[PDB]
Ligand binder design. Structure first.
Ligand SMILES: NC(=O)C1=CN([C@@H]2O[C@H](COP(=O)(O)OP(=O)(O)OC[C@H]3O[C@@H](n4cnc5c(N)ncnc54)[C@H](O)[C@@H]3O)[C@@H](O)[C@H]2O)C=CC1
Ligand SMILES: NC(=O)C1=CN([C@@H]2O[C@H](COP(=O)(O)OP(=O)(O)OC[C@H]3O[C@@H](n4cnc5c(N)ncnc54)[C@H](O)[C@@H]3O)[C@@H](O)[C@H]2O)C=CC1
Ligand SMILES: O=CNC1CCCCC1
Ligand SMILES: O=CNC1CCCCC1
Ligand SMILES: [Co+2]
Ligand SMILES: [Co+2]
Ligand SMILES: [Zn+2]
Ligand SMILES: [Zn+2]
Lengths: 374, 374
């Protein structure tokens, strides 16, 4: 009834940076070749969506943001083979094209046909499928989920289990998979190790879940907001430190606590001071430090190269190092087999028309994750 | 007629900074508990020994430097259950105590008993076995090979095969296994990969040899001294670039050459700007950059943490990551099973006395190694 026809629906347009999302009528063009139109069911509010608003993340505007989501395929374009109308899918803000040198590499997952490095805010072919108030409107990371209907390229969508509870597994689109992957696939946390997690937000809690799944002996959570401590021990943190409670700098504190340094340290905040600090607190001969948080744009850190030269490893990752197309289905299937929980991360559920309340709730620090439902 | 008895011999004493070595009669003391005294046969002249003259490396003075050597044991103290008078040994500037947190780790090698973090110029008991002109002379990294006889601790020495040539295998004591180990053990160069090696001195050539043995398909050597390209190509470099020759930054050049980045990059110079350059020229999603060169005292580098967030890995190491007491005896039999050559590294052979000319050589930049013969 709608296949091949323009669809009119509501979307949260961001006309300019640091303002309010405006629920407006939009036209959604039908999918062209190797494109997929999806009817959204639930979308999460992630810190990266706020960075677009605050200007912390530069992407062309006006934009339809959002990138944690689950939806139902409404129609598929010419040549699509991997999904089907009626299929449950999750958009992938990191594509997996299967052809470039990164997709061929056994480990790397930053596919070269992504929209992170040099955001164009368009589809793969360079156009836009969104028109509102007569004019055209930009995409976000090739996903754009803050809309009732969206169009994504086939390389940016993964089919999942048809029984999945869509309104919970949308976290696998970013928040959970990122933190969980940073532990088990990027840092490759070893059993019996000691871990330090800087940041007890949604992503940081998922790091802890990863560390625990890897069987870490001790998992120390670090956050200046002590209210985030309860949830952290809930999901596996063995102890929690507030750096404000200590006279010494925190890397010193964590070094003493761990008898000379932690085996794995995770920066899950997005600050340059805590990146250098996370690296310092891991053991000098073979600590591993993973950067998960995204710093403010175009801005360098200072660090002493001596920290690395004694044996430290310093690495970072997008989307927890997971090849998206490949890993999202397997992650959903592990959730269906109850191999990990996602309820502890969901603190607020709001109808989609309340997107601005969900965002005001993120800047408040109250939420871990707010889910918008359509 | 030497055991337990004080020995007099010639030794290269460094009385202060920025001065020529002074070959003098010294009093080498007897081995105490768990110590070993060694008569030297051949010793190398590495950059680190020169950094002690200038000030690029602080350690107490007067000192008997030198850390790359081979000799034979003459006598041993009480508790020595690992070597015997007359067997060939190589002193290790990185000890392997076998009891500390690092020595028991599967991967670490920066043993906590070193004298690198807080150099202190003594044996492990805090005293000195060297006396010259009546005054106690400090040690250097627990080795001190610029003397005809020396006393090291048991943890700072490994027995090698009894038929090995001591005018060649001494480079396993530093130069070779540092560079070689950085490729094969630290980076773990995968076979079929593209490598970029910054700096084509003694250590850099060793990195290159590690890259070939690892099965690398392309090995690009980077140096501003185009006189080093011949050896580089002789021992494995497929290509050599001089950054002075190009109108563009060298990492742009290397990114084009490698079609978007190298798999592994190595900084074997010791400069802050080439460290972030080497990191940048390796593939943004799965590249690995190993720091081997040692920078000047203090002086923090500045870098964009976005280089790591996309998937890069950045690490450094001491002694190529080799656990010293274990690896050294192995790497010698390797040379004894002819798994690799050490001829192209040794360029100048001087009698020990004329030590200074060897440094003049080194500062000249005219050589790879120079071996001093006893
Ligand atoms: N590399 C990737 O692929 C991804 C990166 N991210 C980034 O992960 C980071 C964390 O994400 P969320 O948990 O959702 O954000 P969040 O704001 O909910 O969590 C941040 C936590 O860090 C705490 N914190 C703030 N300053 C601190 C300080 N000086 N010291 C210690 N703790 C401090 C805060 O109290 C807060 O609890 C974000 O920067 C996000 O952009 C998001 C997902 C994927
Ligand atoms: N991490 C560890 O365990 C150890 C570290 N090292 C360090 O390795 C480094 C190199 O060792 P060597 O080969 O013996 O010294 P070297 O002086 O023979 O080699 C340095 C090379 O770098 C070249 N170079 C200088 N500036 C350059 C620039 N801007 N761009 C490109 N090339 C440049 C020079 O032409 C020179 O050939 C030293 O800094 C040494 O302290 C040495 C032994 C062990
Ligand atoms: O949080 C989701 N995506 C992020 C990944 C890191 C760069 C900014 C966008
Ligand atoms: O070259 C030998 N030893 C080096 C090891 C790294 C720090 C400086 C001294
Ligand atoms: Co996100
Ligand atoms: Co050396
Ligand atoms: Zn790809
Ligand atoms: Zn040890």
């Amino acid at each position: 009834s709608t296949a091949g026809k323009v669809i009119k629906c509501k979307a949260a347009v961001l006309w300019e940076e640091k303002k309010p999302f405006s629920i407006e009528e939009v036209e959604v063009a039908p999918p062209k070749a190797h494109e997929v139109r999806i009817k959204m069911v639930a979308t999460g509010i992630c810190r990266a969506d706020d960075h677009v608003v605050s200007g912390t993340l530069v992407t062309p505007l006006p934009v339809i943001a959002g990138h944690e989501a689950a939806g139902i395929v409404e129609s598929i374009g010419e040549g699509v083979t991997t999904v089907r109308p009626g299929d449950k899918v999750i958009p992938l803000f990191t594509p997996q094209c299967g052809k470039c040198r990164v997709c061929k590499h056994p480990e790397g997952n930053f596919c070269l046909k992504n929209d992170l490095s040099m955001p164009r805010g368009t589809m793969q072919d360079g156009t836009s499928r969104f028109t509102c108030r007569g004019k055209p409107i930009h995409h976000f990371l090739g996903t754009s989920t803050f809309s009732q209907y969206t169009v994504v390229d086939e390389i940016s969508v993964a089919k999942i289990d048809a029984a999945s509870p869509l309104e919970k597994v949308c976290l696998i689109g970013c928040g959970f998979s990122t933190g969980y992957g940073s532990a088990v696939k990027v840092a490759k946390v070893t059993q019996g190790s000691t871990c330090a997690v800087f940041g007890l937000g949604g992503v940081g809690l998922s790091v802890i879940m990863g560390c625990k799944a890897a069987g870490a002996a001790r998992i120390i959570g670090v956050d200046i907001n002590k209210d985030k401590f309860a949830k952290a021990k809930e999901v596996g943190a063995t102890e929690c430190v507030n750096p404000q409670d200590y006279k010494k700098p925190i890397q010193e504190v964590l070094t003493e606590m761990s008898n000379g340094g932690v085996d794995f340290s995770f920066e899950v905040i997005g600050r340059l001071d805590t990146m250098v600090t996370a690296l310092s607190c891991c053991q000098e001969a073979y600590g591993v430090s993973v950067i998960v948080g995204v710093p403010p744009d175009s801005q360098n850190l200072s660090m002493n190269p001596m920290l690395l030269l004694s044996g430290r490893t310093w690495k970072g990752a997008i989307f927890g190092g997971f090849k998206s197309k490949d890993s999202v289905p397997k992650l959903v299937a592990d959730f269906m087999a109850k191999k990990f929980a996602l309820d502890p991360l969901i603190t607020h559920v709001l109808p989609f028309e309340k997107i601005n309340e969900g965002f005001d709730l993120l800047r408040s620090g109250e939420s871990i994750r707010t889910i918008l439902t359509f």
